[PDB]
Design a protein around this ligand. Structure first.
Ligand SMILES: O=C(O)CC1(CC(=O)N2CCN(C(c3ccccc3)c3ccccc3)CC2)CCCC1
Ligand SMILES: [Mg+2]
Length: 284
């Protein structure tokens, strides 16, 4: 059990803690691929959580500088300014894999922006945000999940990232509203005559359900497009990625069964995840 094992085990802990579903699927990858996934995940999570450490951009700028050190000198010893365990594991991954560093920088830029968040005028802006926060992370994962990356591999991974984000949005409407965030676009809220504050106070209605289902149908079509292009990924990652997906599709059903409540977080029971993987894996 080396120092490097401990760094990876820490990254695992972070991923298990903050996303049971992704944890459940990507943990099924062969050992060197899953460890690379944990490290990427943990870095992205730290970026996502950085503003609330002191309440400003300090820690986020140290994370960015750590990443830039790795990118510029992948083989030098660095005294990392942010979370050393995570940055050592990332550096280890970078020595073995072609990481898209600009995709971490895009992610970090989306975080800086989110300090002065203003609602999206249009869906194009919402989708731009899903790229920023999640398509970027798909791009970063691409060399880990495929043998030979082409632009298609990046395109599928990116679309998978964004459609997972859209599903998070649709699950978390109420919690996000409490945190003063609404991610549905002003254009689409206006068109469907929906006011989130009003829906949070008074319950769902038919306009809200129609708005929600509008975006659910986008996520679902994107998901089918990903599944039809599953073979861009390595054979070992294909059932894993198919499973990660299927579980997020199921989140949409969990929301509908809970009548679109804006007052709790719904989830796919662990035993249900094991059932989806049985279903998938029978066909692998
Ligand atoms: O709970 C929450 O608030 C949100 C959760 C985390 C989450 O949904 N995302 C969406 C993007 N995935 C990417 C990813 C990064 C690293 C490893 C696996 C997956 C990804 C991007 C692209 C392709 C696949 C996967 C990471 C962050 C935690 C609870 C479950 C949903
Ligand atoms: Mg959200």
């Amino acid at each position: 059990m080396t120092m490097m094992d401990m760094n990876f085990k820490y990254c695992h802990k972070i991923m298990k803690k903050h996303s049971k579903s992704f944890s459940y699927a990507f943990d099924l990858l062969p050992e060197d691929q899953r460890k690379a996934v944990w490290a990427i995940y943990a870095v992205c999570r730290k970026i996502d959580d950085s503003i609330d450490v002191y309440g400003d951009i300090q820690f986020l700028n140290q994370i960015k500088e750590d990443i830039q050190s790795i990118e510029k000198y992948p083989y030098e010893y660095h005294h990392f300014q942010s979370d050393r365990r995570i940055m050592m594991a990332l550096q280890h991954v970078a020595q073995h894999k072609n990481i898209a560093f600009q995709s971490f920088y895009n992610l970090i830029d989306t975080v800086y922006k989110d300090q002065h968040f203003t609602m999206f005028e249009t869906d194009a802006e919402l989708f731009g945000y899903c790229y920023g926060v999640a398509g970027t992370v798909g791009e970063v994962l691409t060399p880990i999940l495929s043998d030979h990356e082409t632009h298609q591999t990046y395109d599928v991974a990116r679309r998978l990232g964004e459609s997972l984000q859209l599903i998070n949005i649709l699950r978390d409407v109420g919690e996000d509203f409490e945190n003063e965030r609404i991610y549905f676009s002003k254009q689409r809220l206006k068109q469907y005559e929906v006011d989130i504050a009003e829906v949070y106070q008074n319950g769902v209605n038919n306009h809200y359900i129609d708005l929600w289902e509008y975006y659910a149908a986008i996520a679902e079509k994107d998901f089918r497009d990903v599944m039809d292009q599953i073979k861009v990924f390595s054979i070992e990652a294909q059932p894993i990625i198919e499973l990660a997906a299927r579980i997020y599709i199921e989140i949409l059903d969990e929301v509908r069964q809970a009548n679109y409540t804006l007052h709790e977080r719904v989830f796919v029971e662990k035993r249900k995840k094991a059932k989806l993987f049985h279903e998938i894996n029978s066909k692998y």
